[PDB]
């Protein structure tokens, strides 16, 4: 015979092991593969599709009112409209996104993000906004003077009703963590703020309150690693009719 | 994985197994080998060195008196001087020899032996002896007529003060056993006897009693096998200060 | 299947074994390697850097007074200034060195050492010293007659404010042990003594007491083996906040 000896780790069941096991149905012939549309071979394909931010995650915003930001005409210049917390791990506007849900199955992330904003007013509604990304280190900028010193895009409404704010990967090392400390130097992304660049000017027969829809995807330099369970689902009891599977 | 099954003998500790085991000091670099005189690579090198027989294993022979045989002048012809029991396993004159101690670590033996006798009288002492080896089957020969019918050497004292009695390998099969039955047909070697061939004639100023020293080695056709523990050492208690190794 | 059998040593956990084990994160992609200055690939690089001896390991020498030896002007010739115990294993002036701390993780050592002495008096201070290494066997030499019969260097102060006393590897076999018996023939290194070769002559405006700093490194023929735990750290309780790692 062959002289063998057992190592530490013999007989354990690691749930991430990669071995061959015994077939329970010998000479079983599976169903032939058919072409089905929309095959996913890597979860970073899904993460690059844009999906709606809930920037209006406030009380008195019920259901689908949370998916849009209402802007109106202002009588003061340079006013803040909204800001977006870039904290993906903690429960903010980015959590229930395709880039948000798939990343919460992972601990580390890297790469650029893109925010897309579609203006959903009338054709007669005109306006200019400035969408500012601020790298971390300070507070969230409240005035337009302070906010435009960072990464920004100035957007005129019109025939193309959308801009992209690329949020660049600006970090010390390669990855950031999904830490519960949002204020950590290895987890904080920064801030996105929106200001009136000029104003929303509408005529008398247009609706005086117009809406923005915010989207976010990831770019193709985006990366994820260190897979963990998601915080987005849980249970404390059994589901209904789960006892009927044993009866 | 690899389908395996355990054989009988799995997990046992045989003390004569030959396997590789785990190093306790990884990347340890041993001391470089130096040439030391007198290297032994086979224990049959040691067995071929002659060493003193205790032919005088009698009472009133104390210590080193046991290593020599005193011969004197005789007034009768053809007289027996000494005989040597060739029983190596049982406690005789051959036990405390280099050929005797190393062979008692083994059960089977084979090959020729050589007995060397050095005469340690004066230069003026003259004499002739006959050293007879007798194959087994009968009693030990007491007269010189009976003893010289076997393998013998007739030795004149003089300028070369030593002879060799080759005890030839005369056996049925290849090996003999170190059985406790000395009288067995697979263990008995035979007898070695010494007689006066003429007489010890000394002058008046020489010492009238002269000594022989008997040596025995093995030849290079000698062989040993079936290793066993030696009867030559034992213990019933612990040695002194062996408890201090645990303190 | 394959007929196998288990050897002795199967299922053990040797802490120095060298095997492959199961990855807990499959297809994990580590952070890319960056060039960081000062890479160590062998601990004998660290052992060759000089570091301060505490030759003044006496009472009333508090803290950094232990790192320097104060010499003064003398009115008698040929006087002993200091001596250095070369016992690395026992707690002497060589223990808290780079050559001292890394070697106490090992049991055996070999190779040459170098002692460097930097004179830290004024520019106007002149003097000559003799730094004597004595091989073991006798007592530590107290007079300069006795001490200079061994390995020594005579040092004049001046534009180059440092000498090296090479302590040569003078030993019977290849290695020495870090035995607790300092007086053993396989552990004792010898003695280093310093004498006034002439005298410390300073002027009236220089400080009349000048200092030496003693350094020690290892050479590139130095070697260490038989790794053991260090005596230089220990604990009898838990550290503070180590219970908070479980809460």
């Amino acid at each position: 015979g062959v002289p063998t000896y057992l190592l530490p780790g013999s007989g354990q069941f690691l749930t991430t092991d990669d071995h061959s096991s015994a077939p329970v149905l010998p000479c079983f012939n599976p169903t032939p593969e058919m072409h089905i549309p929309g095959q996913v071979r890597n979860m970073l394909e899904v993460v690059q599709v844009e999906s709606m931010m809930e920037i209006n995650n406030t009380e008195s915003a019920v259901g689908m009112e949370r998916l849009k930001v209402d802007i109106s005409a202002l009588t003061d210049v340079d006013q803040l409209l909204f800001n977006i917390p870039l904290d993906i791990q903690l429960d903010g506007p980015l959590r229930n996104t395709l880039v948000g849900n798939i990343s919460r199955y992972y601990t580390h992330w890297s790469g650029s993000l893109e925010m897309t904003f579609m203006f959903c007013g009338s054709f007669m509604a005109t306006g200019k906004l400035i969408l500012c990304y601020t790298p971390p280190g300070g507070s969230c900028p409240t005035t337009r003077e302070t906010a435009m010193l960072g990464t920004h895009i100035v957007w005129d409404f019109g025939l193309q009703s959308s801009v992209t704010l690329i949020i660049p990967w600006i970090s010390g090392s390669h990855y950031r963590m999904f830490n519960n400390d949002a204020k950590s130097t290895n987890a904080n992304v920064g801030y996105v703020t929106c200001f009136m660049q000029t104003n929303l000017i509408v005529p008398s027969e247009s609706s005086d309150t117009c809406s923005l829809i915010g989207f976010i995807a990831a770019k193709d330099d985006f990366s994820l690693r260190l897979m963990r369970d998601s915080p987005d689902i849980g249970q404390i009891d059994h589901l209904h009719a789960a006892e009927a599977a044993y009866q | 994985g690899v389908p395996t099954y355990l054989l009988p003998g799995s997990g046992q500790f045989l003390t004569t197994d030959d396997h590789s085991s785990a190093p306790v000091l990884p990347c340890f670099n041993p001391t470089p080998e130096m040439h030391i005189p007198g290297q032994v690579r086979n224990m049959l090198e040691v067995v071929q060195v002659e060493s003193m027989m205790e032919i005088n294993n009698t009472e009133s022979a104390v210590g080193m008196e046991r290593l020599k045989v005193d011969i004197s002048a005789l007034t009768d012809v053809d007289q027996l001087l000494f005989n040597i029991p060739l029983d190596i396993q049982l406690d005789g004159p051959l036990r405390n020899t280099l050929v005797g101690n190393i062979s008692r670590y083994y059960t089977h033996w084979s090959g020729s032996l050589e007995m060397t006798f050095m005469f340690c009288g004066s230069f003026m002492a003259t004499g002739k002896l006959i050293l007879c080896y007798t194959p087994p089957g009968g009693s030990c020969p007491t007269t010189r007529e009976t003893a010289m019918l076997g393998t013998h050497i007739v030795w004149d004292f003089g300028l070369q003060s030593s002879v060799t009695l080759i005890i030839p390998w005369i056996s049925g099969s290849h090996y003999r056993m170190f059985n406790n039955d000395a009288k067995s047909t697979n263990a008995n070697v035979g007898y070695v006897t010494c007689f006066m061939q003429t007489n010890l004639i000394v002058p008046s100023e020489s010492s009238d009693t002269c000594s022989l020293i008997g040596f025995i080695a093995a030849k290079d056709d000698f062989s040993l096998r079936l290793m066993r523990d030696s009867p030559d050492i034992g213990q019933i208690d612990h040695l002194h200060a062996a408890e201090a190794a645990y303190q | 299947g394959v007929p196998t059998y288990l050897l002795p040593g199967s299922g053990q956990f040797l802490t120095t074994d060298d095997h492959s084990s199961a990855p807990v994160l499959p297809c994990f992609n580590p952070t890319p390697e960056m060039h960081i200055p000062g890479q160590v690939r062998n601990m004998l690089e660290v052992v060759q850097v000089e570091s301060m001896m505490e030759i003044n390991n006496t009472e009333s020498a508090v803290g950094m007074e232990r790192l320097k030896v104060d010499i003064s002007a003398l009115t008698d010739v040929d006087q002993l200034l200091f001596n250095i115990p070369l016992d690395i294993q026992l707690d002497g002036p060589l223990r808290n060195t780079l050559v001292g701390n890394i070697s106490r993780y090992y049991t055996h050592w070999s190779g040459s050492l170098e002692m460097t002495f930097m004179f830290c008096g004024s520019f106007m201070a002149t003097g000559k010293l003799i730094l004597c290494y004595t091989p073991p066997g006798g007592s530590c030499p107290t007079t300069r007659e006795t001490a200079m019969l061994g390995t020594h260097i005579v040092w004049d102060f001046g534009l180059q404010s440092s000498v090296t006393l090479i302590i040569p590897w003078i030993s019977g076999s290849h290695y020495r042990m870090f035995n607790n018996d300092a007086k053993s023939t396989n552990a004792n290194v010898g003695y280093v003594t310093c004498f006034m070769q002439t005298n410390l002559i300073v002027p009236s405006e220089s400080s009349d007491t000048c200092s030496l700093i003693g350094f020690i490194a290892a050479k590139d023929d130095f070697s260490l083996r038989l790794m053991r735990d260090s005596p230089d750290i220990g604990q009898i309780d838990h550290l503070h906040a180590a219970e908070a790692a479980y809460q």
Binding site: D18, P23, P26, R41, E45 | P3 | -
Partner: peptide
């Protein structure tokens, strides 16, 4: 894989082909 069935093998973790444009650019021009 000493088993005779091909589905008995270990997990196949070497499929690095992507096509994000079937989800990100599903338009005809």
């Amino acid at each position: 894989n000493f088993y005779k069935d091909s589905y008995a093998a270990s997990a196949s973790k070497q499929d690095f082909s992507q096509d994000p444009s079937k989800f990100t650019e599903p338009v005809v021009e």
